[PDB]
Each structure stands twice: as structure tokens, then as C-alpha cells.
From a paper:
Toward this end, we screened for IgGs that showed signal in an enzyme-linked immunosorbent assay (ELISA) using the intact rat GluN1a-[name] NMDAR proteins in the presence of 0.01% LMNG and no signal in Western blotting executed in a denaturing condition. We identified four antibodies that satisfied the above criteria and found one of them, IgG2, that inhibits the activity of the GluN1-1b (hence GluN1b)-[name] NMDARs as measured by two-electrode voltage clamp (TEVC) on cRNA injected Xenopus laevis oocytes. Importantly, little or no effect was observed when IgG2 was applied to the oocytes expressing the GluN1b-GluN2A, GluN1b-GluN2C, and GluN1b-GluN2D NMDARs, indicating that this inhibitory effect is specific to the GluN1b-[name] NMDARs. The resolution of the 3D reconstructions ranged from 3.9 to 6.6 Å as estimated by Fourier shell correlation (FSC) curves, thus, the quality of the cryo-EM density maps was mostly sufficient to identify and trace secondary structural elements as well as the side chains of bulky residues. Furthermore, we solved an x-ray crystallographic structure of [name] at 2.5 Å to facilitate model building into the cryo-EM density. The cryo-EM structures unambiguously showed that [name] binds to the R1 lobe of the [name] ATD. The [name] residues involved in IgG2 binding are not conserved in the other GluN2 subtypes (A, C, and D), consistent with the subtype-specific inhibitory effect shown in the electrophysiological experiments. The cryo-EM structure of GluN1b-[name] NMDAR in complex with [name] provides some insights into how one may improve the inhibitory potency and efficacy by re-engineering IgG2, [name], or Fv2. For example, Arg101 in the H3 CDR loop could be mutated to a glutamate residue to promote a polar interaction with Arg67 of [name]. Furthermore, the L3 loop is in proximity to [name], and the sequence could be altered. Last, the mini-loop between L1 and L2 may be extended and shuffled to promote binding with [name].
Numbering used by the authors:
A (entry chain H): 2 to 14, 19 to 87, 89 to 136, 143 to 222
B (entry chain L): 1 to 196, 202 to 211
Write the structure that this text describes.
């Protein structure tokens, strides 16, 4: 049982959710969003038969929830966006029927950015130093959020610190550090992997000494 | 639209202690309340439904209680893994999440591990010069970085970023970036970040 969502992206002032593993026609559906603040918010509700739809006041009129039971998919159409910038989840209630049930399955989430700025890929710079060693790489001048940083495709997982992006308008900068035993670097190869989906850019940068 | 008042928005507690969050609804919600835990990078995780019904797999240290308008959620024998954000959700009639409650766990003071990094060659040939300082695995979160170029304090061009509390360490990490042009970078030799008796790390453009 999974919910797979489809973007999503950047817009200056329609999402889909594909369901499998359960009987979609028997459950209601909802959209939830997570603000850049740590705040969770219910955004739309649809019933089993798509005849019921409800929205909160902070979004009513601009959003329209819909479903296609034939293809086990849910949709959300968003218009006149503003501080609607958030990550959007499709959530499924824990039980069948048109009664309201707490959510028990969540999609991975797709981000929606509403800004009067334009997509910029990051410039990715390696941080090599001039017991254990700390390395880093700097992800500079991109827009919008988010970016994914990993080390050795994800295999270095302990001792990794990825710092929250800071907007020195109108661009984000982020940095990431990894700590490894002495000699495993530079003997082995350490590469930071960065992905910026809103610009379809992906860099791998090896950390070279000196 | 039913309104949920979660409180407090943020909590600090000792290891092994107990903590308690309350949600207050704008009408009777008839025990149709749930509690979720959210960890950065993970989808929301359900802890309690129908006020006090624990989920399978949820430790008995989590508990809920309440009726009508007043509800409470508690975590006892606090563990480092319990560092997250917690939300209530009424589903009596439609849905309303509470405001959220970030939880931090106290611990013994820790000095940061500091490292300084010169600008990379790629950035230099493109006209820029960012010097990066990491202050890793320290406690508590209040710390200060001072940048010195050739022995003199430099204040313009610094951007700072803290991580959230570590779920296994209870420490914090912080990153400080000094950005100069490549032009002003090449006119000086010694670069220093001091973390506040301070901890100093430097390099010289040889």
C-alpha cells in the first residue's frame, strides 16, 4: 500500500496522487501541506463517491479537489497562489466509508513554490582541509528549494551534517559536512552528490586533497 | 472550521523525564483526536488515535487523555529518539491539525568540533571566495562564531545555519560561511574562525 505523488514545482503569483495496495473507491481522500514553518494543515477533502468536497477558509475558492476512481488517482488543482508555498501530501484515512477518519497512509510529498524569482541551478564546491577528518561541500546560489546532498551515493551516513539552507535573496546556499576516520580519505574516494530537481541538475564532486 | 490550540509550541526536558502537551478545541470533538510525530525527512507517524488508543508498535510511554474540549498527550521516561515535532489532529468533523510542539532533550555541555576550509579553486577562478567553518556536535545550541582576517575582526558577509537537535546525540551542529570576493580574498593571508575561552581554527594562504 503506497501513495505516489506527482509534482509540483515553481510558479509565479495541478498535483496528482497515484494509489495502490488498497481499494481506493472505498476510502475518502485528503490533501495536507507542510508549510516552511513546522506547521501541518488540512487543505482539501473528497469523499468515496467524489460528490463531497470540503476546503478550509484559508484556501477555499482557489483549490479544487477531485478524483478518478477508475484510475485510482486523486488530483488537486491550485489557483491564485501566494504563501501557498509548501510540501503537499495526499493522505488516506484509516478506515473505509464517508465518516472522517484520522490519516494512516501518507504520500512522499511534492513541493510547490510560489515566488517572483526564477529557477537557478546551484554551483557545487568541494571543501577539502588545507584520528578523523571532516570534509564538506558547499551548495551555492540555487532556487528554489529543495536540494538533496548525499555522500558516496548514500553509503556514508553516520557523521554527516547537512545544514538548513539560508536565503540571501534571492538565492539559497547550503553546506554539508561528513566526518570519516583518518586515512580512509584520501585513500578511499569521497564524493558528495547534489540534486536540484526544479532545474534537473545533478552534480557529483569528488573531494580532492590540497 | 474547528480550531485546535496546541501548547506549548516548544519543550525542553531532561532524559528520563516526562512531558505533557495539550490541545483545546473550539467545540466538543467527542474524543476524535489523534497525535502524530514528525521527524525531519520522514512522513508523519501516527502515535495515538481516539484520544488514548495507542498504535501497535508504540511504546507504553506514550499516552493520551481528555474529552469534550480538553485533551492531553504525554511522553514519559524521555529518550533521545523522542526528539521530534508533535501534532494533534481532530477528525470529529473534517480535519484540523494543532500548531505543533517541538521537543528538545537537555544534556551535558559539549564543546564543538571545529574545522575551517579555504575557498575551492573552482570558486576562485569564477571570482568568489567563500570560507567555511563547521562547529559540530556541541551543546547547548547558543554559540558564537567570530571571523578574523589578518588578525582583525571581519563582520560583513557571514551566513550562519544551525541544525536541529540530533536524535541520537542531543547535540547541535552549526555552519558559518564568510563570503568575500576573490579580489579581497587574495589581498590577505590568515583566516580564522573562533567559536565562543574560545576554540580557534585557522589557515594561511601559505
Amino acid at each position: 500500500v503506497k501513495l505516489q505523488e506527482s509534482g509540483g514545482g515553481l510558479v509565479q503569483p495541478k498535483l496528482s496522487c497515484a494509489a495502490s495496495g488498497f481499494t481506493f473507491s472505498s476510502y475518502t481522500m485528503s490533501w495536507v501541506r507542510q508549510t516552511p514553518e513546522k506547521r501541518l494543515e488540512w487543505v482539501a477533502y473528497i469523499s468515496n463517491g467524489g460528490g463531497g468536497t470540503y476546503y478550509p477558509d484559508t484556501v477555499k475558492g482557489r483549490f479544487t479537489i477531485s478524483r478518478d476512481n477508475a484510475k485510482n488517482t486523486l488530483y488537486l488543482q491550485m489557483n491564485s497562489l501566494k504563501e501557498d508555498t509548501a510540501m503537499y501530501y495526499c493522505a488516506r484515512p484509516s478506515r473505509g466509508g464517508s465518516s472522517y477518519w484520522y490519516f494512516d497512509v501518507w504520500g512522499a510529498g511534492t513541493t510547490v513554490t510560489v515566488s517572483s524569482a526564477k529557477t537557478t541551478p546551484p554551483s557545487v564546491y568541494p571543501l577539502a582541509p588545507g584520528s578523523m577528518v571532516t570534509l564538506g561541500c558547499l551548495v551555492k546560489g540555487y532556487f528554489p528549494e529543495p536540494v538533496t546532498v548525499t555522500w558516496n551515493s548514500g553509503s556514508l551516513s553516520s557523521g554527516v551534517h547537512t545544514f538548513p539552507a539560508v536565503l540571501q535573496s534571492d538565492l539559497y546556499t547550503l553546506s554539508s559536512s561528513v566526518t570519516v576516520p583518518s586515512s580512509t580519505w584520501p585513500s578511499e574516494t569521497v564524493t558528495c552528490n547534489v540534486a536540484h530537481p526544479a532545474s534537473s541538475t545533478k552534480v557529483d564532486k569528488k573531494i580532492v586533497p590540497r | 472550521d474547528i480550531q485546535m490550540t496546541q501548547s506549548p509550541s516548544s519543550l525542553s526536558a531532561s532524559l528520563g523525564g516526562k512531558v505533557t502537551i495539550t490541545c483545546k478545541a473550539s467545540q466538543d470533538i467527542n474524543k476524535y483526536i489523534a497525535w502524530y510525530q514528525h521527524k525531519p525527512g520522514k512522513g508523519p507517524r501516527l502515535l495515538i488515535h481516539y484520544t488514548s488508543s495507542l498504535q501497535p508498535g508504540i511504546p507504553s510511554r506514550f499516552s493520551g487523555s481528555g474529552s469534550g474540549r480538553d485533551y492531553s498527550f504525554s511522553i514519559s521516561n524521555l529518550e533521545p529518539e523522542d526528539i521530534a515535532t508533535y501534532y494533534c489532529l481532530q477528525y470529529d468533523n473534517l480535519y484540523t491539525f494543532g500548531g505543533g510542539t517541538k521537543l528538545e532533550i537537555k544534556r551535558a555541555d559539549a564543546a564543538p568540533t571545529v574545522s575551517i576550509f579555504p575557498p575551492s579553486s573552482e570558486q576562485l577562478t569564477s571570482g568568489g571566495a567563500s570560507v567555511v567553518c563547521f562547529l559540530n556536535n556541541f551543546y547547548p545550541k547558543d554559540i558564537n562564531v567570530k571571523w578574523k582576517i589578518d588578525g582583525s575582526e571581519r563582520q560583513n558577509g557571514v551566513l550562519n545555519s544551525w541544525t536541529d537537535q540530533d536524535s541520537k546525540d542531543s547535540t547541535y551542529s552549526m555552519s558559518s560561511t564568510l563570503t568575500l570576493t576573490k579580489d579581497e580574498y587574495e589581498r590577505h593571508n590568515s583566516y580564522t574562525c573562533e567559536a565562543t575561552s574560545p576554540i580557534v581554527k585557522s589557515f594561511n594562504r601559505n
